[PDB]
């Protein structure tokens, strides 16, 4: 009936010292609104809040952030000067107000921000499909395909399998989050695996087309690219196998 | 046998700003706290000696809980303006009284929570502390919300729990004040109203608590014909004043007798006109 | 002590 | 609906000429709460007048006490002036210590 | 003095089984509401329940039950018939009136619940997967293994994903899966 809390953007990558505004709107006529970050080991820390149109108040971790509640509808979060420290997941939140003190917080879905020393470490994924092991088929009667997206930064990727042109979901495992190729580095590039398992017979049929698909969220058009290699913009990279009776 | 009662009052002043909320609290006939939205202070404040002694945690809690209430009340003014479809020109008035009652044994006797709008019953909680009574259709809506939110379960938990725990603490803390009886000091006055009739007034002063019974008797017999009673009024020092009058035939002043019953009188008192 | 403020308004 | 104020005017302690006392004016049984209550010395307002906090009776009607320091004299008249939307013009009740 | 404490960082239970998620609050305020939220892999944060200060102890709601004990300041969450779906991060929280009277929140740091399938016929083994596009690139797949057995590494810069539950709904069959690739031995891995 109601959208709830909407947050833009969903993914973003600055250079240190660049600025940006996360926008949050709520369609439920709520009086209070909130801006949280969420980090490993810290859970949910409030950055700023607002009990009403015009007014805003410092939370638990204001330093580095400004906010405006110009209209009841929306609550703006501004990073004037991006630090790597502010790499995080930002979550907007609203609450009805004193008409309903027992009201719980309503949260949006979250903006995933990565702030980096240099945008020359931003890299798109390299995608590879790996065919099922002819040994798997004659021990189990099944065929696990594997996808592998590697070499990417930030860790902003959505992966999907596409059998004869349509998204599928049955038989699909994808890692909860990308792993670091070099976990000792604060600017490591990431890798993500996914598996699609189908009956042996379906993999053995060469009328069947498998595509692994990765949506990568990198640079907008407005970033400069003094470099030479392709500007790492938001893009899709895919690998595909046909079925095989070999 | 004693009581605690809070009295919240919230008025809209459309244009002049946000509503004026005013809360006061009583133990028997003695005020002990207040909050005023327009005051510099912005705190629940002491108004008897025996509460001053509560610590900063008490005052903070009481301050925030009561601000939270003023805020609900503020919204409620607009929700009820909407129920009655009244214009946002007019000053309207939510008033809430609640509190509890303990017997001399110190145990729960009754609880109360009653709200009104523009000076008339809006919604009350019944003695069952489990059900509400709407006075009109606006209240019948409130009543569905409060039936679903289980509001009654909230009041009941308060009135049978924290209301009596704390009433009892206040009576121990304030025992030299809250459990004093001050007896009425009584005279009689005479005002010829005519060559045939005269007004005997019977006075009672400095008494606490405010509960008192003044009756007249003629030739030793109940008399209410031609009798006035004023509304019991405050002295300003935490004691009460009230008189009773009868119009009598001139010459016949000596047959009427004022009778005075109060808690701190072992025997009822008796006055007669003395000229 | 005052009651807690109600979880819902009127 | 709106209720018009009852007014009583008296001293805390029985009056004694040249002796300290408090002049009280009790307004009760009125609605709404918005009222204006002045204490008069020979028809002249008094400056440092205080009131009790706003409360009400069983029947929803508000009461206030208005009080000040004073010292009664044979000479000086005292009285209370009340005003309220129920009134065409201000009601004055004269103080009568001999009541 | 508002804390919420969850104390369990991480808890794991096989499916069709009861799990209780402990939560302890600390306040001196008397007009509090306690909450639980769920955060699945997706990230979003879903309201589950509110217990208010005046509330009764038990609160059932489908497979979800909660147990409020004011004397000991605990508000523990039970799940009957745990289904892998329930796998998630679960957040206990509490609201009290703040300075201006507005209710405001304190969150625990979260419990991470892993509900892992019931593998009624383990056949653990590994397989070499050749790249579709003839790189000699190869990845190793450890699959069809026990839900109790667990993944680690042996020859660092080599990578190993975590375990990953996969459902062919058609066949009514769950499988565990972890993948390994070096840059450079399909077996001699996962040891």
GROMACS .gro file of N, CA, C and O in nm, chain B residues 100-170:
model
  284
  346UNK      N    1  -0.461   0.646   4.182
  346UNK     CA    2  -0.507   0.527   4.258
  346UNK      C    3  -0.549   0.564   4.400
  346UNK      O    4  -0.555   0.682   4.431
  347UNK      N    5  -0.591   0.464   4.476
  347UNK     CA    6  -0.657   0.473   4.609
  347UNK      C    7  -0.611   0.349   4.686
  347UNK      O    8  -0.631   0.233   4.631
  348UNK      N    9  -0.552   0.369   4.804
  348UNK     CA   10  -0.513   0.258   4.896
  348UNK      C   11  -0.596   0.271   5.024
  348UNK      O   12  -0.626   0.387   5.062
  349UNK      N   13  -0.630   0.157   5.085
  349UNK     CA   14  -0.694   0.147   5.217
  349UNK      C   15  -0.593   0.169   5.330
  349UNK      O   16  -0.473   0.179   5.302
  350UNK      N   17  -0.638   0.173   5.458
  350UNK     CA   18  -0.550   0.205   5.571
  350UNK      C   19  -0.440   0.098   5.590
  350UNK      O   20  -0.331   0.132   5.635
  351UNK      N   21  -0.472  -0.027   5.549
  351UNK     CA   22  -0.383  -0.147   5.539
  351UNK      C   23  -0.278  -0.128   5.429
  351UNK      O   24  -0.190  -0.215   5.421
  352UNK      N   25  -0.295  -0.028   5.341
  352UNK     CA   26  -0.196   0.016   5.240
  352UNK      C   27  -0.211  -0.053   5.105
  352UNK      O   28  -0.131  -0.025   5.013
  353UNK      N   29  -0.312  -0.139   5.091
  353UNK     CA   30  -0.335  -0.220   4.968
  353UNK      C   31  -0.424  -0.146   4.869
  353UNK      O   32  -0.497  -0.053   4.910
  354UNK      N   33  -0.414  -0.187   4.742
  354UNK     CA   34  -0.492  -0.129   4.631
  354UNK      C   35  -0.640  -0.136   4.669
  354UNK      O   36  -0.677  -0.239   4.727
  355UNK      N   37  -0.714  -0.027   4.649
  355UNK     CA   38  -0.863  -0.023   4.649
  355UNK      C   39  -0.919   0.002   4.507
  355UNK      O   40  -0.988  -0.084   4.456
  356UNK      N   41  -0.897   0.119   4.445
  356UNK     CA   42  -0.944   0.150   4.308
  356UNK      C   43  -0.835   0.223   4.230
  356UNK      O   44  -0.746   0.286   4.292
  357UNK      N   45  -0.849   0.216   4.098
  357UNK     CA   46  -0.777   0.299   4.000
  357UNK      C   47  -0.877   0.374   3.915
  357UNK      O   48  -0.997   0.339   3.918
  358UNK      N   49  -0.827   0.473   3.842
  358UNK     CA   50  -0.903   0.574   3.765
  358UNK      C   51  -0.817   0.620   3.649
  358UNK      O   52  -0.696   0.639   3.669
  359UNK      N   53  -0.879   0.642   3.534
  359UNK     CA   54  -0.820   0.713   3.416
  359UNK      C   55  -0.937   0.766   3.335
  359UNK      O   56  -1.017   0.685   3.294
  360UNK      N   57  -0.950   0.896   3.321
  360UNK     CA   58  -1.070   0.956   3.258
  360UNK      C   59  -1.023   1.073   3.173
  360UNK      O   60  -0.945   1.154   3.225
  361UNK      N   61  -1.059   1.073   3.046
  361UNK     CA   62  -1.021   1.181   2.953
  361UNK      C   63  -1.148   1.250   2.907
  361UNK      O   64  -1.259   1.189   2.910
  362UNK      N   65  -1.132   1.376   2.868
  362UNK     CA   66  -1.248   1.458   2.828
  362UNK      C   67  -1.205   1.551   2.715
  362UNK      O   68  -1.084   1.567   2.696
  363UNK      N   69  -1.301   1.608   2.644
  363UNK     CA   70  -1.269   1.705   2.537
  363UNK      C   71  -1.365   1.823   2.551
  363UNK      O   72  -1.486   1.801   2.570
  364UNK      N   73  -1.311   1.944   2.545
  364UNK     CA   74  -1.394   2.067   2.557
  364UNK      C   75  -1.481   2.059   2.683
  364UNK      O   76  -1.588   2.120   2.684
  365UNK      N   77  -1.435   1.986   2.785
  365UNK     CA   78  -1.506   1.988   2.914
  365UNK      C   79  -1.611   1.881   2.931
  365UNK      O   80  -1.698   1.899   3.018
  366UNK      N   81  -1.604   1.774   2.853
  366UNK     CA   82  -1.710   1.671   2.860
  366UNK      C   83  -1.647   1.533   2.848
  366UNK      O   84  -1.552   1.519   2.771
  367UNK      N   85  -1.701   1.435   2.922
  367UNK     CA   86  -1.650   1.297   2.907
  367UNK      C   87  -1.620   1.274   2.759
  367UNK      O   88  -1.706   1.309   2.672
  368UNK      N   89  -1.500   1.223   2.733
  368UNK     CA   90  -1.459   1.164   2.605
  368UNK      C   91  -1.450   1.013   2.625
  368UNK      O   92  -1.534   0.942   2.569
  369UNK      N   93  -1.356   0.964   2.705
  369UNK     CA   94  -1.339   0.817   2.725
  369UNK      C   95  -1.292   0.792   2.868
  369UNK      O   96  -1.209   0.871   2.918
  370UNK      N   97  -1.345   0.689   2.932
  370UNK     CA   98  -1.305   0.649   3.068
  370UNK      C   99  -1.270   0.500   3.073
  370UNK      O  100  -1.321   0.421   2.993
  371UNK      N  101  -1.183   0.464   3.167
  371UNK     CA  102  -1.152   0.322   3.190
  371UNK      C  103  -1.246   0.279   3.302
  371UNK      O  104  -1.268   0.359   3.394
  372UNK      N  105  -1.303   0.160   3.293
  372UNK     CA  106  -1.403   0.119   3.394
  372UNK      C  107  -1.330   0.061   3.515
  372UNK      O  108  -1.210   0.033   3.504
  373UNK      N  109  -1.401   0.045   3.626
  373UNK     CA  110  -1.338  -0.007   3.750
  373UNK      C  111  -1.268  -0.139   3.720
  373UNK      O  112  -1.174  -0.172   3.793
  374UNK      N  113  -1.314  -0.211   3.618
  374UNK     CA  114  -1.252  -0.341   3.581
  374UNK      C  115  -1.110  -0.317   3.532
  374UNK      O  116  -1.037  -0.415   3.513
  375UNK      N  117  -1.072  -0.190   3.514
  375UNK     CA  118  -0.937  -0.158   3.462
  375UNK      C  119  -0.907  -0.251   3.345
  375UNK      O  120  -0.790  -0.284   3.325
  376UNK      N  121  -1.011  -0.292   3.271
  376UNK     CA  122  -0.989  -0.390   3.162
  376UNK      C  123  -1.069  -0.349   3.038
  376UNK      O  124  -1.047  -0.410   2.932
  377UNK      N  125  -1.152  -0.245   3.049
  377UNK     CA  126  -1.247  -0.202   2.944
  377UNK      C  127  -1.271  -0.050   2.951
  377UNK      O  128  -1.252   0.008   3.058
  378UNK      N  129  -1.311   0.012   2.840
  378UNK     CA  130  -1.329   0.158   2.828
  378UNK      C  131  -1.476   0.195   2.803
  378UNK      O  132  -1.548   0.113   2.763
  379UNK      N  133  -1.515   0.319   2.825
  379UNK     CA  134  -1.650   0.373   2.802
  379UNK      C  135  -1.633   0.500   2.718
  379UNK      O  136  -1.573   0.598   2.768
  380UNK      N  137  -1.674   0.492   2.591
  380UNK     CA  138  -1.679   0.604   2.497
  380UNK      C  139  -1.808   0.679   2.527
  380UNK      O  140  -1.898   0.617   2.580
  381UNK      N  141  -1.808   0.811   2.510
  381UNK     CA  142  -1.920   0.901   2.546
  381UNK      C  143  -1.988   0.942   2.417
  381UNK      O  144  -2.107   0.978   2.425
  382UNK      N  145  -1.914   0.939   2.307
  382UNK     CA  146  -1.964   0.976   2.173
  382UNK      C  147  -1.885   0.897   2.069
  382UNK      O  148  -1.808   0.809   2.108
  383UNK      N  149  -1.911   0.922   1.940
  383UNK     CA  150  -1.860   0.839   1.828
  383UNK      C  151  -1.709   0.863   1.814
  383UNK      O  152  -1.635   0.769   1.791
  384UNK      N  153  -1.664   0.987   1.828
  384UNK     CA  154  -1.519   1.018   1.822
  384UNK      C  155  -1.449   0.920   1.916
  384UNK      O  156  -1.365   0.846   1.868
  385UNK      N  157  -1.490   0.914   2.042
  385UNK     CA  158  -1.434   0.827   2.148
  385UNK      C  159  -1.441   0.679   2.110
  385UNK      O  160  -1.347   0.603   2.153
  386UNK      N  161  -1.544   0.638   2.035
  386UNK     CA  162  -1.567   0.497   1.992
  386UNK      C  163  -1.456   0.448   1.899
  386UNK      O  164  -1.435   0.322   1.891
  387UNK      N  165  -1.398   0.541   1.822
  387UNK     CA  166  -1.279   0.519   1.735
  387UNK      C  167  -1.156   0.503   1.825
  387UNK      O  168  -1.091   0.397   1.824
  388UNK      N  169  -1.126   0.606   1.903
  388UNK     CA  170  -1.020   0.598   2.003
  388UNK      C  171  -1.035   0.459   2.065
  388UNK      O  172  -0.931   0.388   2.078
  389UNK      N  173  -1.159   0.421   2.100
  389UNK     CA  174  -1.181   0.300   2.183
  389UNK      C  175  -1.132   0.177   2.104
  389UNK      O  176  -1.070   0.088   2.165
  390UNK      N  177  -1.154   0.172   1.973
  390UNK     CA  178  -1.109   0.054   1.895
  390UNK      C  179  -0.956   0.050   1.898
  390UNK      O  180  -0.904  -0.058   1.928
  391UNK      N  181  -0.890   0.162   1.868
  391UNK     CA  182  -0.740   0.172   1.872
  391UNK      C  183  -0.690   0.120   2.007
  391UNK      O  184  -0.600   0.037   2.007
  392UNK      N  185  -0.751   0.166   2.116
  392UNK     CA  186  -0.702   0.138   2.252
  392UNK      C  187  -0.739  -0.004   2.288
  392UNK      O  188  -0.675  -0.061   2.381
  393UNK      N  189  -0.841  -0.058   2.222
  393UNK     CA  190  -0.876  -0.201   2.247
  393UNK      C  191  -0.767  -0.288   2.183
  393UNK      O  192  -0.722  -0.384   2.249
  394UNK      N  193  -0.720  -0.251   2.064
  394UNK     CA  194  -0.619  -0.325   1.987
  394UNK      C  195  -0.477  -0.302   2.042
  394UNK      O  196  -0.403  -0.400   2.054
  395UNK      N  197  -0.440  -0.179   2.076
  395UNK     CA  198  -0.309  -0.144   2.136
  395UNK      C  199  -0.296  -0.199   2.279
  395UNK      O  200  -0.181  -0.195   2.332
  396UNK      N  201  -0.408  -0.243   2.339
  396UNK     CA  202  -0.420  -0.300   2.477
  396UNK      C  203  -0.386  -0.194   2.582
  396UNK      O  204  -0.345  -0.232   2.691
  397UNK      N  205  -0.409  -0.066   2.552
  397UNK     CA  206  -0.399   0.047   2.647
  397UNK      C  207  -0.444   0.006   2.788
  397UNK      O  208  -0.368   0.034   2.882
  398UNK      N  209  -0.560  -0.057   2.807
  398UNK     CA  210  -0.615  -0.087   2.941
  398UNK      C  211  -0.511  -0.167   3.020
  398UNK      O  212  -0.478  -0.126   3.132
  399UNK      N  213  -0.454  -0.271   2.959
  399UNK     CA  214  -0.346  -0.356   3.016
  399UNK      C  215  -0.233  -0.264   3.066
  399UNK      O  216  -0.179  -0.299   3.169
  400UNK      N  217  -0.206  -0.149   3.000
  400UNK     CA  218  -0.101  -0.050   3.039
  400UNK      C  219  -0.146   0.023   3.165
  400UNK      O  220  -0.071   0.019   3.262
  401UNK      N  221  -0.261   0.092   3.160
  401UNK     CA  222  -0.316   0.162   3.280
  401UNK      C  223  -0.316   0.063   3.398
  401UNK      O  224  -0.266   0.094   3.507
  402UNK      N  225  -0.372  -0.056   3.378
  402UNK     CA  226  -0.392  -0.150   3.491
  402UNK      C  227  -0.255  -0.177   3.555
  402UNK      O  228  -0.247  -0.174   3.678
  403UNK      N  229  -0.154  -0.205   3.474
  403UNK     CA  230  -0.018  -0.237   3.521
  403UNK      C  231   0.032  -0.121   3.606
  403UNK      O  232   0.092  -0.146   3.711
  404UNK      N  233   0.006   0.002   3.561
  404UNK     CA  234   0.044   0.124   3.636
  404UNK      C  235  -0.037   0.135   3.767
  404UNK      O  236   0.023   0.132   3.871
  405UNK      N  237  -0.169   0.138   3.760
  405UNK     CA  238  -0.259   0.167   3.875
  405UNK      C  239  -0.249   0.062   3.987
  405UNK      O  240  -0.279   0.099   4.101
  406UNK      N  241  -0.216  -0.064   3.959
  406UNK     CA  242  -0.210  -0.173   4.060
  406UNK      C  243  -0.064  -0.194   4.104
  406UNK      O  244  -0.040  -0.266   4.203
  407UNK      N  245   0.031  -0.139   4.027
  407UNK     CA  246   0.176  -0.154   4.049
  407UNK      C  247   0.240  -0.022   4.091
  407UNK      O  248   0.227   0.015   4.208
  408UNK      N  249   0.302   0.051   3.998
  408UNK     CA  250   0.385   0.169   4.033
  408UNK      C  251   0.303   0.278   4.102
  408UNK      O  252   0.363   0.356   4.180
  409UNK      N  253   0.173   0.288   4.077
  409UNK     CA  254   0.092   0.397   4.137
  409UNK      C  255   0.090   0.375   4.288
  409UNK      O  256   0.107   0.476   4.359
  410UNK      N  257   0.072   0.251   4.336
  410UNK     CA  258   0.054   0.229   4.482
  410UNK      C  259   0.194   0.221   4.544
  410UNK      O  260   0.214   0.283   4.648
  411UNK      N  261   0.288   0.149   4.484
  411UNK     CA  262   0.426   0.143   4.536
  411UNK      C  263   0.469   0.284   4.577
  411UNK      O  264   0.531   0.300   4.686
  412UNK      N  265   0.442   0.381   4.490
  412UNK     CA  266   0.501   0.516   4.501
  412UNK      C  267   0.414   0.605   4.590
  412UNK      O  268   0.471   0.687   4.664
  413UNK      N  269   0.283   0.585   4.588
  413UNK     CA  270   0.189   0.652   4.681
  413UNK      C  271   0.233   0.621   4.824
  413UNK      O  272   0.236   0.711   4.904
  414UNK      N  273   0.258   0.494   4.852
  414UNK     CA  274   0.305   0.443   4.982
  414UNK      C  275   0.437   0.511   5.020
  414UNK      O  276   0.450   0.547   5.139
  415UNK      N  277   0.533   0.523   4.926
  415UNK     CA  278   0.666   0.586   4.952
  415UNK      C  279   0.642   0.732   4.990
  415UNK      O  280   0.703   0.777   5.086
  416UNK      N  281   0.554   0.799   4.916
  416UNK     CA  282   0.522   0.943   4.935
  416UNK      C  283   0.458   0.966   5.073
  416UNK      O  284   0.481   1.072   5.132
   0.00000   0.00000   0.00000
